[PDB]
Design an enzyme around this catalytic site. Structure first.
Site, PDB file in Angstrom:
ATOM      1  N   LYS B 162      -1.487  -2.602 -13.057  1.00 53.00           N
ATOM      2  CA  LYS B 162      -2.442  -3.586 -13.553  1.00 53.00           C
ATOM      3  C   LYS B 162      -1.736  -4.936 -13.572  1.00 53.00           C
ATOM      4  CE  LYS B 162      -6.166  -1.261 -14.654  1.00 53.00           C
ATOM      5  NZ  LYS B 162      -7.495  -1.646 -14.132  1.00 53.00           N
ATOM      6  N   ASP B 191      -4.044  -3.970  -9.124  1.00 54.63           N
ATOM      7  CA  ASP B 191      -5.413  -4.265  -9.535  1.00 54.63           C
ATOM      8  C   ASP B 191      -5.327  -5.411 -10.554  1.00 54.63           C
ATOM      9  OD1 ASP B 191      -7.995  -4.301 -10.570  1.00 54.63           O
ATOM     10  OD2 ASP B 191      -8.198  -2.115 -10.554  1.00 54.63           O
ATOM     11  N   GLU B 217      -6.386  -4.885  -5.318  1.00 55.96           N
ATOM     12  CA  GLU B 217      -7.706  -4.637  -5.896  1.00 55.96           C
ATOM     13  C   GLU B 217      -8.161  -5.721  -6.866  1.00 55.96           C
ATOM     14  OE1 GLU B 217      -8.308  -0.604  -7.085  1.00 55.96           O
ATOM     15  OE2 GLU B 217      -9.901  -1.073  -8.525  1.00 55.96           O
ATOM     16  N   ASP B 242     -14.125  -3.438  -6.557  1.00 52.69           N
ATOM     17  CA  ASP B 242     -14.391  -2.429  -7.580  1.00 52.69           C
ATOM     18  C   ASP B 242     -15.584  -2.857  -8.434  1.00 52.69           C
ATOM     19  OD1 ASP B 242     -14.412  -0.724  -9.774  1.00 52.69           O
ATOM     20  OD2 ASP B 242     -12.346  -1.093 -10.370  1.00 52.69           O
ATOM     21  N   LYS B 266     -16.419   5.023  -7.841  1.00 49.58           N
ATOM     22  CA  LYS B 266     -16.211   5.566  -9.181  1.00 49.58           C
ATOM     23  C   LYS B 266     -17.448   6.348  -9.570  1.00 49.58           C
ATOM     24  CE  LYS B 266     -12.991   2.033 -10.874  1.00 49.58           C
ATOM     25  NZ  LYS B 266     -12.622   1.189 -12.054  1.00 49.58           N
ATOM     26  N   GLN B 294     -12.538   4.905 -14.247  1.00 44.20           N
ATOM     27  CA  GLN B 294     -13.277   4.009 -15.138  1.00 44.20           C
ATOM     28  C   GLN B 294     -12.697   4.145 -16.553  1.00 44.20           C
ATOM     29  OE1 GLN B 294     -16.816   2.636 -13.589  1.00 44.20           O
ATOM     30  NE2 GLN B 294     -15.398   1.194 -14.560  1.00 44.20           N
TER      31      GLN B 294
HETATM   32  O1  LIG Z   1     -10.517  -1.612 -12.762  1.00 40.48           O
HETATM   33  C1  LIG Z   1     -10.059  -0.451 -12.636  1.00 40.48           C
HETATM   34  O2  LIG Z   1      -9.868   0.140 -11.540  1.00 40.48           O
HETATM   35  C2  LIG Z   1      -9.663   0.338 -13.922  1.00 40.48           C
HETATM   36  C3  LIG Z   1     -10.519   0.053 -15.203  1.00 40.48           C
HETATM   37  C4  LIG Z   1     -10.439  -1.367 -15.778  1.00 40.48           C
HETATM   38  C5  LIG Z   1     -11.659  -1.582 -16.297  1.00 40.48           C
HETATM   39  C6  LIG Z   1     -12.470  -0.592 -15.911  1.00 40.48           C
HETATM   40  O3  LIG Z   1     -13.607  -0.415 -16.357  1.00 40.48           O
HETATM   41  O4  LIG Z   1     -11.910   0.208 -14.950  1.00 40.48           O
HETATM   42 MG   LIG Z   2     -10.182  -1.591 -10.457  1.00 45.48          MG
END
Ligand SMILES: O=C(O)C[C@H]1C=CC(=O)O1
Ligand SMILES: [Mg+2]
Ligand SMILES: O=C(O)C[C@H]1C=CC(=O)O1
Ligand SMILES: [Mg+2]
Lengths: 366, 366
Positions: B162, B191, B217, B242, B266, B294
């Site tokens: 992240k 991401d 991402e 995403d 997702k 998620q």
């Molecule tokens: O963004 C992601 O892949 C992971 C996560 C962060 C917020 C969300 O709702 O998903």
């Molecule tokens: Mg993401």
């Protein structure tokens, strides 16, 4: 639900009258009955129509690729490993109807095994489709008479006129005659099967601008790339790509390239697994789609309605489900029935059909 | 297999340690357990995670839309009328996880009814997926330690870091530390959750050009439209969309517009029916796709692996299936087990899971 065997049996059934169009003619249904046998005693079936003038497949070639390549690669898989079968078959390029027949036969076996119709397993949106009839070449007066006979007899209110002849006026006069005869009571569209040049196609459509045609299908060769793209951009109504979009990749190339603005889905070439990929791609891109006819026998027609009734996007339009009527006979124990211009998906498990043993013995050619 | 009732039960389970990222934070799993009851006594389940900072849904809002709109619109449909349910729910805009939970619960019930896993009904390509773990913000040394602990304990060899913090060097130092610590033995990608501007994103990626990142991402907001498109065109690796591609229509707009070159799938937001539409669209267009997380509990993770294992395109990449590990507890009778960096799809019918009655009674908040 393990596949123990897959067979391909060639058979031939004469047509009462040949179906003629720009790219070729069909005087008999020289198809291949494909059967998927499971270790539960269940037998799923489907047919593969060889269309050399469309995909380049032959009855002999279909049997060969199935017996020599697909059958040995799929035996041992369960009916719930469709993606493995899909991937394995994809290793072989082309051979669309051979692949599609195997996939649909697999779905038929699965449905029988689960006591569920293919239609409901696919989505079960509705239980019937309106029917569209393809009118093949013939004298103008004769084509009109055929449409009148068909509408009165089966209640069919949608007709796809085969065009692509010269002079162009021959076909435009036919379409105009049909519109004058039935008025707005029927839906009309045309399919040129790559018969006209893009220039002739535009002139023909301009001449029929007042006939409210719903679609224009493969009026000129998709391979006349630039002129095809120019033509598609000149027409108001959606331009249906058929033989030029046998795979999802073709759909993407033709649509993004501007050579297609609507997509024909034919279970004969993409089966159920593949057809779902085409439907989702077309819906995702935002394009109209219509269930087409591969000059199918009743077995292939049962497949078309099975898929077409499963989704809203395919059932909002009439489906081409009536050309089997020109065959002199067929292989089902219970013939498909069209009434009030509609065809219901069969109520039974799988495809809801059964092959008549005596019919198969009489028409097979192996 | 007729739906007689659909319930939405809110519950809350504390996290052992909060998951922090650019767009928000999760300190507890305040989800909604969705149940679809059939006239056969079968109960299908799934969860809906409210992510206000992603879709704008709230735990209260999810329960409300399901009880007030979806439940009454779907009761009476059979489990083999998914397209009717899909179409009816589509009349309501948004509410992604609420819709997805209902669809997955329906698939769970269907699988139980047929004694088939969701994975095999969807395609059954394989039986397991490699696991990817999302590392949330924290001190550099602490993030590295978390990765080492996780890899040694579960065998996980893929990590999604992240990022999206300032200065950018804070995150690039983390990624570099991870690569120096594990070498080429692990896969790494990032991401940013819309945290950086496109300009900061480019500089960060250029600084990490030697770290062999597999994907980038949502580094910057997709809504910073033009600069986002410029950034995507400047990066070598695929740029995963995403939160900006919650629907197939968004996938089409973002991909054709150039703001996305890879797609995150997702199940929490597109379920199974919807996720199939995304997969087919992405495959048809020719784009890489990855199963995302998620911040799912074990129920949502069971759904992710169910879909991910069904197709080749989703299983060729590791799936984000391990963040449930940070939860202090969960609702399954049998916890999900990750070993050798992989997660197998459950062997049982439907989702292959069962809700522990005592856990539900203890954590529900209604
Ligand atoms: O963004 C992601 O892949 C992971 C996560 C962060 C917020 C969300 O709702 O998903
Ligand atoms: Mg993401
Ligand atoms: O083209 C159609 O829609 C109908 C038919 C003509 C050739 C073929 O194989 O399909
Ligand atoms: Mg055609």
């Amino acid at each position: 639900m393990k596949i123990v065997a897959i067979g391909a049996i060639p058979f031939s059934i004469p047509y009462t009258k040949p179906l003629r169009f720009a790219s070729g003619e069909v005087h008999a249904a020289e198809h291949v009955l494909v059967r998927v046998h499971t270790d539960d005693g269940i037998v799923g079936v489907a047919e593969a129509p060889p269309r050399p003038f469309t995909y380049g497949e032959t009855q002999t070639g279909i049997v060969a690729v199935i017996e020599q390549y697909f059958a040995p690669a799929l035996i041992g898989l369960t009916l719930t490993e469709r993606e493995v079968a899909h991937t394995r078959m994809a290793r072989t390029v082309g051979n669309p109807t051979a692949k599609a027949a195997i996939d649909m036969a697999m779905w038929d076996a699965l449905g029988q095994s689960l006591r569920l119709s293919v239609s409901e397993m696919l989505g079960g949106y509705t239980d019937r489709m309106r029917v569209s009839h393809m009118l093949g070449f013939d004298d103008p007066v004769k084509m009109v008479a055929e449409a009148e006979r068909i509408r009165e007899t089966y209640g069919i209110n949608t007709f796809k006129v085969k065009v692509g002849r010269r002079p162009v006026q021959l076909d435009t006069a036919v379409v105009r005659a049909l519109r004058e005869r039935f008025g707005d009571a029927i839906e009309l569209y045309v399919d040129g099967n790559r018969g006209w040049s893009a220039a002739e196609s535009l002139r023909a459509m301009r001449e029929m601008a007042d006939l409210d045609l719903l679609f224009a299908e493969e009026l000129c060769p998709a391979d006349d790339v630039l002129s095809r793209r120019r033509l598609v951009g000149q027409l108001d109504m959606p331009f249906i790509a058929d033989e030029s979009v046998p795979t999802p990749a073709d759909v993407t190339r033709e649509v993004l390239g501007g050579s297609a603005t609507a997509i024909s889905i034919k279970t004969a070439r993409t089966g159920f697994t593949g057809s779902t990929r085409v439907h989702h791609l077309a819906e995702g891109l935002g394009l109209d789609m219509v269930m087409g006819n591969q000059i199918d026998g009743q077995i292939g027609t049962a497949c078309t309605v099975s898929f077409g009734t499963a989704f809203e996007r395919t059932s909002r339009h009439a489906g081409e489900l009536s050309n089997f009527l020109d065959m002199s006979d067929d292989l089902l124990t219970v013939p498909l029935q069209i009434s009030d211009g509609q065809l219901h998906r069969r109520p039974g498990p799988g495809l809801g059909i059964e092959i008549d043993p005596d019919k198969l013995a009489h028409y097979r050619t192996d």
